[PDB]
């Protein structure tokens, strides 16, 4: 039948902020998950409960691609049971996560000389996220004992932080494009199969 549209996912011109990470549903198609790995321009390719070259003789109901931009020293957080601002307040992977985590450096697309302020991440939250939750709220965060009345001030800080990517940052502060593939097998006709 038709080919899975991973090219739209991986080669998308725009990538979401991690606090507002994007989920695409892959369905009714044939996917060569080897040809994904074969494009050996990925600095991170960690799979969980599955492996490339085995995804080609496997069928699933739905495949999810979550995509976003973070920074280099935060890639290590895009993994199950990790802690930190990204894993807690932006994007949590469950204990039973089954899929692959693919990231790569995007300094050439996502930095700007004055700094890029389009890419944001949440720095503060009253409670840790649950696996695969998304929080897009913009309410001022009360870091202190007094209320904030919808307005910034002492201990009253707008939670989203700007990455401010610039080409001259050290590697750990450069933008990385991340794609997390999650494979789900409901009790239903499988519709995403490898060529096998």
């Amino acid at each position, epitope marked *: 039948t038709n080919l899975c549209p991973f090219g739209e996912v991986f080669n998308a011109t725009r990538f979401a902020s991690v606090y507002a990470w994007n989920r695409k549903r892959i369905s009714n198609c044939v996917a060569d998950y080897s040809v994904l790995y074969n494009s050996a321009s990925f600095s991170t390719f960690k799979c969980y409960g599955v492996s490339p070259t085995k995804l080609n003789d496997l069928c699933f109901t739905n495949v999810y691609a979550d995509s976003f931009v973070i920074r280099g020293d935060e890639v290590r957080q895009i993994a199950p049971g990790q802690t930190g601002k990204i894993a807690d307040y932006n994007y949590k992977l469950p204990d039973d996560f089954t899929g692959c985590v693919i990231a790569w450096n995007s300094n050439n697309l996502d930095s700007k000389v*004055g*700094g890029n*302020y389009n890419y*944001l991440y949440r*720095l503060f939250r009253k409670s840790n996220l649950k696996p695969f939750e998304r929080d897009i709220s913009t309410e001022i965060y009360q*870091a*202190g004992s*007094t209320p*904030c*009345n919808g*307005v*910034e*001030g*002492f*201990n*009253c*800080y*707008f939670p*989203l*932080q*700007s*990455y*401010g990517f*610039q080409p*001259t*940052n050290g590697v750990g502060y450069q933008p990385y494009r991340v794609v997390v593939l999650s494979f789900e097998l409901l009790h239903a006709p499988a519709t995403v199969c490898g060529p096998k």
Partner: antibody
Amino acid sequence: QVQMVESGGGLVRPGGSLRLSCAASGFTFSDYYMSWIRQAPGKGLEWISYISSSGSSMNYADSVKGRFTISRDNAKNSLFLQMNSLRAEDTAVYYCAREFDLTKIIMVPPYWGQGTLVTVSS
Amino acid sequence: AIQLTQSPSSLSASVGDRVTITCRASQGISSYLAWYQQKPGKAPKVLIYAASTLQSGVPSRFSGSGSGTDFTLTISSLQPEDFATYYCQQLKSYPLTFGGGTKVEITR
């Protein structure tokens, strides 16, 4: 030693444009909210603008919204104020000020530059 | 926008006298208050932050008190070099706002 040095002041045509610059040192710049405050000859202190530490939020007093824009460059330890459609009421000494430290939760004293005078005159 | 009401707008007093300046906030601002000193042709400088903490350097003649809506700046023994205009600043919430100032002259 906290240092905040402003520059770019001087004479601007009524209706023209001027860009102020505030250079900072002695503290991790990217941790602090910053503000522009101005004082007209003989008058009191008027706050006009703030930018959050990372540049994700900013706001303006009403006398200045639509005409001015604040910005910062955390790589260069620099705050900026772009000023457009200037008029006689805008003649003042313009100060830059470092305020809240989102890194901590303890109240810290603000720190101000020395001022620079912009005169809006033909 | 929190409004601050500073009193008095000017005063004169002799060397060694006690000088008291007050600020009234249109809302509770608990302790989120600074007091500034501005000498002639200089930039405002913080004397007290958090309503009552002395900035380094500042002589201990200066002190502040209050919490909520009513704050007080005290110079316990006015000295000649204390000629200045003093301001209170609310720090609870942007847009930051100031009192009108208190010109302090010395009687001689």
